[PDB]
């Protein structure tokens, strides 16, 4: 007869609560754990991946949808002139939507860490030239010029000595940052290359990414 | 520091509504719950972010009236594994067999809970099993045994009212399902377009859209 | 870098490692031994050197599915089709060889459990399911329809979280990825269920200027390895 | 001497009256309730005796009829974390998402309470955000998000009946509070003017009064 | 007064749960076990006949 | 069946006791208690003053 009396809060259902509860079948021993590649104990091990950062966004229909994953770049108009920016925060709708990460991030709320961008070039083995990436932080926004972009943090980026580059997202927690790319030379073509080339853009999370409340997203389903 | 918010104990150990079970008094009298991780229509695309999975998971039952209304009705869940039969009719042999077990709640009493171990011969669940199962069925006319492996089967759930006379109050229970111990293995990536069928992944190529949202141009905000 | 001469049992390729060499999952392919709840090694581990498949300007993609590729075909296609327990891993060696006035990144992927759909459409028709021509295509593979979603909702631009190598005719011409056993059950019927679907898909889309043969060659070359049987059934 | 009166968690941690929620028979059949601190409308001042404050909170939850009838109803409480999107309606699919914890008691059963961790990006609570919200620009119109700091959101509380069909019983859910292990920074001095808004300690400059009582001189009684 | 809260799931009656029960009658001592030939302890036993 | 007698006084919600609850979100690590100045723990290191 050892004596309770009842705290408030009994019998309450809490779809939450970490309890362990009868089970069905207590004479019943599962198929044993074998082992399985590619285990994964934790989802920061798919930020940590090179995930494709959908910039192009066209789909116009979608015979050129595949278009999304590419840079144009030519020789056309020339010199100087912007090629590409974009947003730099998973979280938001979305060129990121396109990488594991934005998609993860879209399953949870707050996030933290540094991010690793890197650019992969598609065009000839003779084809040179060379690009600027400048990374903007949220404050100030976009610099209207190279000249002003090449004061800010950036990275001058090559062609015929290197086709793969990797940018440092330093850090990100809460405008939102951006990165812009510049044509900092002329598009090279020898005599039979084509005047026109294009970049895949490759992302992922650095070692220090957290991400902490949970939350569901948005996909339909019908009968 | 805090990662524990992205381990996957933390990512499906939560109870969603998972099964819905009419029981009016003007369907037949019983209901057969087969039991599907869907339902919860969103761990649909939690779930294929990896091919193989395994974990227990425990069930809870809270049962009332449409209005809400709580009325002192004596229930009977009654868990029926894979392979065994489900129940014919009302007073089928099913209530009775006890192989498959069962649960006599009322509904004075709070929710009723129950755990379930994990049920396959293989090693862990699939969401993905790219060919036809042991062993292959030709004769033509048939493409139905596909992308469908039964060893996922987790068995079925049945209510009661009770029998043998009917009950008087219209009743629904609301199926409740959270997971523990899991384990996952190779990662697949995310669905990006809608789904169609279930235990088929299907899409519609007619309306084919991308994955996140799009702008005019590259250079623009 | 200059030279390559790579010779087993028969075959023979000639390839490098001068640049990126090997991808695996982490984890070579090993054996097994418990309870389970023949080992060629003398003729099995050749390089069975697969068709090669052209490329034109406007192509979308080409995917083979692990292992009815080689079933029918070769001495391990035959004791595939007689025994019926199967388990292996697998040197897969993908070399395109072109120009360097060319251009045009490839991603040669590894899915595991590739499970296909189709449209559904044609007349009216709102439920349909694969023909055994499309979820087993053998050797000659299968021209995919739509890349983006790899015929299975399954969008690309996340493919790279498995198993994965880039071409890029700029810096590599050469693939090389290295499969182990993936499996719910340590043995299956190598007939009925196709483990893992190779993908190549084209991203940037090979380009040329005027007059430069348009049609660039993939060899894809693979190796079985680790491969294991149990019991046989008669011969014809 | 003993002080044990006089410390945080003796000055603090009592259960008091935060919400007052009505649900009549013929608002909607729901209710949203933000969580607020306030309600008690004596913590404010009781607060605002310090700047930076951090706990975590245990609420209660008392339902009957304004009658103080007790009914068989069986409630769902619904907590909503901060970020996450609010019932639309009494029917929307906020209610199974189930990332949003909920609670299922009936009123026959005993106040369901349930404690609720600190919740801030921020190191801790701030009841002073002299400046303007992260980011406040420039041009025009905007003026209100002003001493507003988001990072002091705790979250939502929002309840059903439950469905389809409205209960026959009127509903009154009272919600009380209680704090746990307070640690407070920078002390304020205390208010001496009466409240005014909400997230803002304006005064009514046009009766201004002295702190306390006064007298008529210095040297009389 | 020692603080209790009834986990969900109470008053249920489960067809399977091994737990202890009241013994009808306390104060008895059956029949002692003595030793019969063949004794059986698991199935398996039998499915090697 | 650990053989419990309920002592009166159950069901009782009072605003004073020092019950520990269930948690909303046991999954989850709040902010880290960083270092802030001048914290208070007793109301009476301001009577000092």
Request: glycine letters at 8%; hydrophobic letters at 35%.
């Amino acid at each position: 007869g050892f004596p309770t009396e009842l705290k408030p809060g009994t019998n309450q259902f809490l779809t939450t609560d970490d309890g362990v509860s009868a089970p069905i079948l207590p004479n019943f021993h599962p198929t044993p754990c074998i082992h399985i590649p590619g285990e994964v104990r934790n989802l920061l091990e798919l930020c940590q991946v090179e995930t494709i950062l959908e910039v192009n966004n066209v789909p116009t229909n979608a015979t050129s949808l595949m278009e999304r994953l590419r840079f144009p770049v030519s020789a056309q108009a020339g010199k100087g002139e912007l090629c590409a920016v974009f947003r730099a925060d998973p979280g938001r709708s979305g060129p990121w939507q396109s990488t594991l990460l934005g998609q993860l991030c879209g399953y949870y709320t707050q996030w933290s860490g540094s991010l690793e961008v890197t650019f992969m070039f598609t065009g000839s083995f003779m084809a040179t030239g060379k690009m600027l990436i400048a990374y903007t932080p949220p404050g100030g926004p976009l610099p209207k010029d190279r000249a002003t972009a090449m004061l800010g943090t950036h990275v001058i980026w090559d062609f015929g000595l290197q086709s793969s580059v990797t940018l440092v997202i330093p850090w990100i927690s809460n405008t939102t940052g951006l990165v812009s790319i510049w044509y900092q030379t002329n598009y090279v073509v020898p005599i039979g290359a084509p005047n026109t080339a294009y970049i895949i853009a490759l992302a992922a999370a650095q070692k220090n990414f957290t991400m902490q409340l949970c939350k569901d997203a948005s996909d339909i389903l019908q009968t | 520091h805090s990662t524990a918010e992205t381990t996957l104990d933390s990512f499906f150990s939560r109870a969603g509504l998972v099964g819905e079970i009419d029981l009016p008094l003007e369907p037949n009298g019983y209901a057969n719950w087969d039991i599907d991780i869907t339902g919860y229509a969103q761990m649909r695309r939690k779930v294929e972010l990896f091919t193989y999975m395994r974990f227990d998971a425990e069930f809870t039952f809270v049962a009332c009236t449409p209005t809400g209304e709580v009325v002192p009705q004596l229930l009977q869940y009654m868990f029926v594994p894979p392979g065994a039969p489900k129940p014919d009719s009302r007073e089928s042999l099913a209530w009775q067999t006890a192989t498959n077990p069962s649960v006599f709640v009322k509904l004075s009493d709070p929710p009723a809970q129950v755990s379930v171990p994990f049920m396959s011969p293989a090693s862990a669940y699939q969401w993905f099993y790219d060919g036809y199962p042991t062993f292959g069925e030709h004769k033509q006319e048939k493409d139905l045994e596909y992308g469908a492996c039964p060893n996922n089967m987790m068995g079925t759930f049945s209510v009661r009212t009770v029998g043998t006379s009917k009950s008087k109050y219209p009743l629904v229970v609301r199926i409740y399902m959270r997971m523990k111990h899991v384990r996952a293995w190779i990662p697949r990536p995310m669905r990006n377009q809608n789904y169609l069928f279930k235990a088929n992944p299907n899409y519609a190529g007619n309306s084919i859209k991308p994955t996140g949202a799009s702008r005019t141009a590259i250079t623009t905000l | 870098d200059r030279v390559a001469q790579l010779t087993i049992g028969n075959s023979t390729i000639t390839t490098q490692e001068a640049a990126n060499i090997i991808v695996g999952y982490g984890e070579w392919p090993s054996y097994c031994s418990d309870s389970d709840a023949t080992r060629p090694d003398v003729s099995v581990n050749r390089f069975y050197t697969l068709d090669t498949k052209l490329w034109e300007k406007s192509s979308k993609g080409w995917y083979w599915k692990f292992p009815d590729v080689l079933t029918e075909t070769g001495v391990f296609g035959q004791n595939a089709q007689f025994h019926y327990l199967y388990r292996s891993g697998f040197c897969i060696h993908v070399q395109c060889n072109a120009s360097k006035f060319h251009q045009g990144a490839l991603l040669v992927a590894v899915l595991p459990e590739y499970v296909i759909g189709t449209v559904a459409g044609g007349t009216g028709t709102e439920d349909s399911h694969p023909p055994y021509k499309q979820t087993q295509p053998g050797a000659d593979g299968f021209e995919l329809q739509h890349p983006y979603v790899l015929d299975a909702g399954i969008p690309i631009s996340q493919l790279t979280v498995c198993p994965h190598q880039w071409i890029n005719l700029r810096t590599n011409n050469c693939a090389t990825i290295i499969v182990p056993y993936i499996n719910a059950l340590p043995f299956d019927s190598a007939l009925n269920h196709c483990n893992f679907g190779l993908l190549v898909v084209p991203i940037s889309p090979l380009d040329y200027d005027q007059g430069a043969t348009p049609v660039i060659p993939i060899t894809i070359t693979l190796a079985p390895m680790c491969s294991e049987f149990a019991g046989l059934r008669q011969a014809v």
